[PDB]
Structure 1
Amino acid sequence: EVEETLKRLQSQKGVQGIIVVNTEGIPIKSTMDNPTTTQYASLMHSFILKARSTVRDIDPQNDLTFLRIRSKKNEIMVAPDKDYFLIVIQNPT
């Protein structure tokens, strides 16, 4: 089902990459060139680990749901769950 999920989130305009990492740091989902983005997946894996550390150390009972990042060039969206995570990259269209 994952390829049509890839398709209709890839037919949305502005999306450069649905490169979704697991909790393991493995590129479990990628659509672009894998050595260009696996270290960014590891970067965002360690920083979604500090973002879960941010929510669970600032507050006891809060759970981290979603992060919005708007950069200078693009708007890259980071979606945690409590088990497995998501990284996706969008241009402003």
Structure 2
Amino acid sequence: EVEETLKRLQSQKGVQGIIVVNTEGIPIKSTMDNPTTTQYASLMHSFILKARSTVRDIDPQNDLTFLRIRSKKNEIMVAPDKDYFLIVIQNPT
């Protein structure tokens, strides 16, 4: 079921890859090449920790809901969860 929905997302014209980060920055599923698989998973793990702390710091009664990062090259979206988040990368062009 979820395998089909992930493929469905991957088929979207914007999406350039999906990484399922599970073990604290170490993913278990990917539709991307190995260097990118680890690159995005690791970097975004560090970032989301900062983003979630940022929310707790700006207000001590709230957690993260979502983050978006945009760049000239590509755009990356992540959502927080109880155990682990998911990374999706799109080509804005």
Q: How big is each residue's C-alpha offset from its partner over 1:48-84, in whole Å with a ceiling of 9 and x where there is no partner?
A: 1111111112211112100122211222111112332
Q: Give ranges in structure 2 of 5+ residues lacking alignment.
A: none
Q: Which ranges of 4 or more aligned residues in structure 1 deviate by more than 4 Å?
A: none
What SS is found at the alignment partner of 1:78? strand
What SS is found at the alignment partner of 1:63? coil
What SS is found at the alignment partner of 1:28? strand
- State the identity as a percent: 100
- TM-superposed CA distance for 1:44, in Å, is 0.7
- TM-superposed CA distance for 1:21, in Å, is 0.9
Counterpart residue number, 2:27: 27
Higher strand share: 2
**TM-score after normalising by structure 2:** 0.85
Query: In 1, distance between residues paired with 2:46 and 2:30?
Result: 18
Q: Give ranges in structure 1 of 5+ residues lacking alignment.
A: none
**RMSD (CA atoms):** 1.6
**TM-score after normalising by structure 1:** 0.85
Instruction: Give the direction of change, closer, same or farther, for the CA distance of 1:23–1:48 in structure 2 (3 Å limit).
Output: farther
Contact 1:76 1:90 in 2 (8 A): yes
What SS is found at the alignment partner of 2:27? coil
Task: Point out the more displaced range, 57-66 or 76-85.
Answer: 76-85
Instruction: Give the direction of change, closer, same or farther, for the CA distance of 1:64–1:23 in structure 2 (3 Å limit).
Output: farther
